[PDB]
């Protein structure tokens, strides 16, 4: 069981800086006097790390449910053994396999079960009156468990339950990792005499117990123990004491680390590759000593941030309208079938007519069907009365849809109809259009029925006469220009789409987009996807070409189809990076040089040199750079760049 | 299971009972239109071939 806390004044969390902390053995092998690099999860050096306080003098008690990333770093400058253990899980509601690594004064229990975790589990220590010793009595960390398979008990560990307010004497660090379901624990106790601002000393971490559970964790939370002395009333609402403690929580990131080993086999120092340019030079050379000279570490690539595509100047349309504006149309038993291929189609003009009575278009959103394209577009045109326009829908039953043109469930078509009584009907009786009323059975969708056979009703054949039990299925209309609104001739066109493996021939392309120049961007001009700048060229193309090559046979010239301007193509990433090092036992700062990248910072002939000031005086040089310019460490004293004196 | 949204990595178990969407219209997990329940029962029979 658990109880709830009351609202009180807390302290906001602080942020401190790590100093060569979070280094552990990445493997269980022995290495002597070697400098090898591994790609695992480590804490970055000089990184921003969180800080949580636990002192009483006020009433600081923070237990946030921090998310468990790919590896965490838990360091504590423990003095009076305040913190007891840690919990892990995803939702903490007895639904997933949670964890409980809790350390009591007698034995260490690691129970991976589905505990009922409350809002703020904690350990309660009560001070006895007759006995002058602190003992743990309030065991409120969970309610009960449901089912589990793993339960491990580690070696016993003695503990002191008395809390004080003095300075810390020991430092404990913990690293928890989860690779492919396997739990990892690394820890080592290191004595120290300090309160905050952790020392710059180096100490590796060795694993103690390896835990093969086989699950994934996304959240974690730490546990603290408070004391119930005679000063406090003894209620866990507003009066309590927690001694003095401070635990640091840091997240591990995947970086390459260069590990140093002595002849005894222990780790003495670690060098990162993505923290400092000087540290990058140390780990690429696989040595801790760097001499004066030039060095190449990696390359500089200018990644584009935007992509622009424009195939046409504007969207266009091909000759059409005969399926809409015509002298006459067909009936429903034999309707006109039209196929659209190798035609660019615009549906905006088909909507801004403001003359259609009805429009139903399912499957695709009508406002966003222009950008998406399909392979083939089928146009089916037929006439119908005003009261049968409601029947044309997927999932309807009647006398016209089930016998002439069935609508299937997966109908992504587009139905357009309008009133054309002034042309499709005439005085005296317009009976030029026919329809089918009688049929033996149902028909498949997208099927045309042109059979004129007389539908037999009874069991007596008639041999094609007009007698008994034999009715002719095709019947005339009742169109008249003097009718109302429910029986007018409506011209229905169905615009269906096909889904099959073929390039989109009929499509409205990406039209006009925002044009950007003089920046390294990505473009797709109908034949290539190249990342580069677009400068204004001075060479005119013949009026029948699109692309342009060079002596080296590279597409470095393209014509924009918007208004026919010629734009050059030039890559934005040139060469790599370089670092200038004065050498060992001389300096610590370094200068970063770019090979062929155009831009304290000095624009040299051989690219950009940063971190080194330029001096007009000329001396003899020792570290070459290129193009008659060197770098050296002179007079405090910094790295200077100058023309080499002959 | 007969249908899935996309490819799955090897040595992975999927126990998702969510109703697959084939189009762009949600169904609120009913037996409606343009959607269907992905898990289907077998057709085992002792008198099979």
């Amino acid at each position: 069981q658990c109880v709830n806390l009351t609202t009180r004044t807390q302290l906001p969390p602080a942020y401190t800086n790590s100093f060569t902390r979070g280094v552990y053995y990445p493997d269980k092998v022995f290495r002597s006097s070697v400098l090898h690099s591994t790609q695992d999860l480590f804490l970055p050096f000089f990184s921003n790390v969180t800080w949580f306080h636990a002192i009483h003098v006020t009433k600081r008690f923070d237990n946030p449910v921090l998310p468990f990333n790919d590896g965490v770093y838990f360091a504590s400058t423990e003095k009076s053994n305040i913190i007891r253990g840690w919990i892990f899980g995803t939702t903490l509601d007895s639904k997933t396999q949670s964890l409980l690594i809790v350390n009591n004064a007698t034995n260490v229990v690691i129970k991976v079960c589905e505990f009922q975790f409350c809002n703020d589990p904690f350990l309660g220590v009560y001070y006895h009156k007759n006995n002058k010793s602190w003992m743990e009595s309030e065991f409120r960390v969970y309610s009960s468990a449901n089912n589990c398979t793993f339960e491990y008990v580690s070696q016993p560990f003695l503990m002191d339950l008395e809390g004080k307010q003095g300075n810390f004497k020991n430092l404990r660090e913990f690293v928890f990792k989860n690779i492919d379901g396997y739990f990892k624990i690394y820890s080592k106790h290191t004595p120290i005499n300090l309160v905050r601002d952790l020392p710059q000393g180096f100490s590796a971490l060795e694993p103690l117990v390896d835990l093969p559970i086989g699950i994934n964790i996304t959240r974690f939370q730490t546990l603290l123990a408070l004391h119930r002395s005679y000063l406090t009333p003894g209620d866990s609402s507003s009066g309590w004491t927690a001694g003095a403690a401070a635990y640091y929580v840091g997240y591990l990131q995947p970086r390459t680390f260069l590990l140093k080993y002595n002849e005894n086999g222990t780790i003495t120092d670690a060098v990162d590759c993505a923290l400092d340019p000087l540290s990058e030079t140390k780990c690429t050379l696989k040595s801790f000593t760097v001499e004066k000279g030039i060095y190449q570490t990696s390359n500089f690539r200018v990644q584009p941030t935007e992509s622009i595509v424009r195939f046409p100047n504007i969207t266009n349309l091909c000759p059409f309208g005969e399926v809409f504006n015509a002298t006459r149309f067909a009936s429903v038993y034999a309707w006109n079938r039209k196929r659209i291929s190798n035609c660019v189609a615009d549906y905006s003009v088909l909507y801004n007519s403001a003359s259609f009575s009805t429009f139903k278009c399912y499957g695709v959103s009508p406002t966003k069907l222009n950008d998406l394209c399909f392979t083939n577009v089928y146009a089916d045109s037929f006439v119908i009365r005003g009261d049968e326009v409601r029947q044309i829908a997927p999932g309807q039953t009647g006398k016209i849809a089930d016998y002439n043109y069935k609508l299937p469930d997966d109908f992504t078509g587009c139905v357009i109809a309008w009133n054309s009584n002034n042309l499709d009907s005439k005085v005296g009786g317009n009976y030029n259009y026919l329809y089918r009323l009688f049929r033996k059975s149902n028909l498949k969708p997208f099927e045309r029925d042109i059979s004129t056979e007389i539908y037999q009703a009874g069991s007596t054949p008639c041999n094609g006469v007009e007698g008994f039990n034999c009715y002719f299925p095709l019947q005339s209309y009742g169109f008249q220009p003097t009718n109302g609104v429910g029986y007018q001739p409506y011209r229905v066109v169905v615009l269906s789409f096909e889904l099959l493996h073929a390039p989109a021939t009929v499509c409205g392309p990406k039209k006009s987009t925002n044009l950007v120049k003089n920046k390294c961007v990505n473009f797709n001009f109908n034949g290539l996807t190249g990342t580069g700048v677009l400068t204004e060229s001075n060479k005119k193309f013949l009026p029948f070409q699109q692309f342009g090559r060079d002596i080296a046979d590279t597409t470095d010239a393209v014509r924009d189809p918007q208004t026919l301007e010629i734009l050059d193509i030039t890559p934005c990433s040139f060469g790599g990076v370089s670092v200038i090092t004065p050498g060992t036992n001389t300096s610590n700062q370094v200068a970063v040089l770019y090979q062929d990248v155009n831009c304290n910072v000095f624009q040299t002939r051989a690219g950009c040199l940063i971190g080194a000031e330029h001096v007009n005086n000329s001396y003899e040089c020792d570290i070459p750079i290129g193009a008659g310019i060197c770098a050296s460490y002179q007079t405090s004293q910094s790295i200077i760049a100058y023309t080499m004196s002959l | 299971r007969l249908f899935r949204k996309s490819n799955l990595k090897p040595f992975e178990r999927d126990i998702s009972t969510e109703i697959y969407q084939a189009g762009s219209t949600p169904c609120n997990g009913v037996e409606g239109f343009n959607c269907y329940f992905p898990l289907q029962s077998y057709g085992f029979q002792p008198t099979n071939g």
């Epitope: 429009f359 326009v389 409601r390 | 239109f33």
Partner: antibody, heavy 120, light 110 residues
């Protein structure tokens, strides 16, 4: 994104001319052929459609409000205005300039409603 | 002359399901798209559903619309009533170049 702000006086005398202007910031009136419309709503009553306009001269009006609605679009100031003639005391309604794309569809963005009361 | 007939007052307890109708007089509901609008009192209206079967991004999935063209009544089925649903409901149509709105439904607890 984009937003629409209405302006003009909140009062009008009977048998006079109403002048309500709705301005657009964060987008272009002519771009995308985005239609434009006006909707009023009396207090305690349902929404009433007044008329719709295109960035060109195309327009349409409610037959109950026909021959009384004059709406014009100026692209240089990126706004559209509506003029109402022969206003009466029954025209007290909350006017919304209506941002809408599909003429048979929806008013996806609604401007804030200016209170219009016939001034006596 | 085409209008949308909508019930004035609809009252059910929270947690249940309701049905709001929108009946067309002359034109069929299947002829044109119907858009429903949920408007706070003293605030701009907001489209709660459109295209008669699918939902805008941002509203809960409880707002469902259905069309039965036989009775010419546009239906909006709303389930699991809460406090924030207490507003007006208007249905829209188009007829022929003349947008026609609905009467208005007052969704109340009782």
């Amino acid at each position: 994104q984009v937003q629409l702000q209405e302006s003009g006086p909140g009062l009008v005398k009977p048998s006079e001319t109403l002048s309500l202007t709705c301005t657009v910031s964060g987008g272009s009136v002519s771009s995308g052929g985005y239609f434009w419309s006006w909707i009023r709503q009396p207090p305690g009553k349902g929404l009433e459609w007044i008329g719709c306009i295109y960035y060109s001269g195309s327009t349409n009006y409610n037959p109950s409000l026909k021959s009384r609605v004059t709406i014009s679009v100026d692209t240089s100031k990126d706004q559209f205005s509506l003029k109402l003639s022969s206003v009466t005391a029954a025209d007290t309604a909350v006017y919304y300039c209506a941002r809408q794309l599909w003429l048979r569809g929806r008013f996806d963005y609604w401007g804030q409603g200016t209170l219009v009361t016939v001034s006596s | 002359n085409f209008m949308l007939t909508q019930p004035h007052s609809v009252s059910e307890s929270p947690g249940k399901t309701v049905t709001i109708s929108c009946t067309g007089s002359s034109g069929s509901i299947a002829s044109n798209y119907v858009q429903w609008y949920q408007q706070r009192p003293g605030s701009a209206p907001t489209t709660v559903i459109y295209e008669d079967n699918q939902r805008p991004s941002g509203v809960p999935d409880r707002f469902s619309g259905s069309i039965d063209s036989s009775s010419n009544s546009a239906s909006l089925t709303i389930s699991g009533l809460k406090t924030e649903d207490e507003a007006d409901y208007y249905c829209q149509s188009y007829d022929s170049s003349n947008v026609v709105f609905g009467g208005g439904t007052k969704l109340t607890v009782l």
